[PDB]
Amino acid sequence: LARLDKVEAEVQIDRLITGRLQSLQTYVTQQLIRAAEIRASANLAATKM
Amino acid sequence: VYADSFVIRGDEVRQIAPGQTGKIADYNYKLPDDFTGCVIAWNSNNLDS
Amino acid sequence: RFASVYAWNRKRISNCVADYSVLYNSASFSTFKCYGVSPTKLNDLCFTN
C-alpha cells in the first residue's frame, strides 16, 4: 500500500489474501479435528467420573 | 451507453486505458478501475491538423 | 554525452532529499516505466541508496 498503485497493489494483495486465507482455514480445520479428540477424552473423563 | 470523444496526440493514445497514468489520464480524462467499455481511436491528421 | 550501452554508466546517489515529481512532471520522457515502485508513491517513499 505504501509502494504500489491500487490497480496492481490489488494483484499483490490478492496473493497475500489467498495465502493467508488458506493458512487460516488449514489451522481452523486442524483445530476442529483436535476438538473432536479432546471431546472424546472429555466424554471418557465424564464417564470415569 | 455514454459515448465520449476527443482528440489527442498519437503518442498519448496509450494513456486512454483503465489504470493508466500521465498528463491525459491524470488531468484530462480518467477511466475507472473497473471500466466496462471499449476505446476506439484512429489517426486524424488529415482531419484535425 | 551518454555511455555506450555495452559500457553503461552507473552512479550511486545517496545522503540527499529527492523530488521525483520534477522528473514525472517533465514532458520530454517517452518512457517512464517503474517496476515494483509506483511513480506517484515514489515521491512519498524513501530508500537506503
Residues 6+ apart with CB under 8 A from A36: none
How many angstroms separate the CA of residue A18 from the nearest CA in chain B? 21
Cβ proximity of A45 and A38 under 8 Å:
no
- What are the φ and ψ backbone dihedral angles of C4, each rounded to 5 degrees? -65, 135
Please give the single-letter amino acid code of residue B35.
F
A-chain residues within 8 Å CB-CB of B21? 5
How many angstroms separate the CA of residue A24 from the nearest CA in chain C? 28
Residues 6+ apart with CB under 8 A from C28: none
Cβ proximity of A15 and A7 under 8 Å:
no
Residues 6+ apart with CB under 8 A from A3: A9, C36, C37, C38, C41, C45
Q: What resolution in Å is listed for this PDB structure?
A: 4.0
**Contact yes or no for A3 and C37 at CB 8 A:** yes
∠ CA C48-C5-C41, rounded to 5°: 35
Determination technique for this PDB entry? Answer: cryo-EM
- In angstroms, the CA C35 to CA B23 distance is 20
Closest CA to A5 of B30, B21, C27, C48: B21
- In angstroms, the CA C43 to CA C20 distance is 6
